[PDB]
């Protein structure tokens, strides 16, 4: 996450860190004790999910680790266009909830008026390094027309754009699958955007979670 700052320790209990071969890969969102929501392009072998983490460089009393027993990629996911970039991960062990481990409710209404949004993650910072401490930034949803002009013919109804006109606060590599939180609900998932990272002109592109509330419910209830 570029041009942001360290999160408040108690403000991200739904944040998951996804590992493969002992390295941070992506973010994720805890949405149910047994399920983590992430981006489909984060699919790697033997995924390890860490909940209750703030600083990845230290062991923390609140952390809970789980292997993934099931990875459910959306059936219409298209790697090339990042369309329908969503995946559900079933945890081997249901998450032990605490003040630092809690699910985040999803936004079900695609017509939600809120634009008081924030992003979070352990992705690349402005200096190019990977932070040990989780980063946070407030961003705003960008109109569909403006996003369509920024990325001609790349924006589907399954994507939502967000950014910041002032400093270009944006998500980056490693933040993928992480949450775009609007009005204390999950509104989007970090999917793709401008390289180098910066949202002043080209906003970040997020999976539009409200479009998937039926598919999520059917997967969890299967
Ligand atoms: N500007 C943005 N909002 C943005 C840019 C890039 C990524 N992700 C990547 O570049 C990436 C690259 C390799 C592997 C995984 C990734 O997520 C995520 C968000």
From Swiss-Prot:
One of its GO terms (biological process) is hormone metabolic process. InterPro entries: Peptidase_S1_PA, Peptidase_S1_PA_chymotrypsin, Peptidase_S1A, Trypsin_dom, TRYPSIN_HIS, TRYPSIN_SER. PROSITE patterns: TRYPSIN_DOM (PS50240), TRYPSIN_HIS (PS00134), TRYPSIN_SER (PS00135). GO terms for cellular component: cornified envelope; cytoplasm; endoplasmic reticulum; extracellular region; extracellular space; intercellular bridge; mitochondrion; nuclear membrane. Induction: By spinal cord injury. This effect is particularly prominent in macrophages, microglia and reactive astrocytes. PANTHER family: KALLIKREIN-6, KALLIKREIN-RELATED. This is Kallikrein-6. The gene is KLK6.
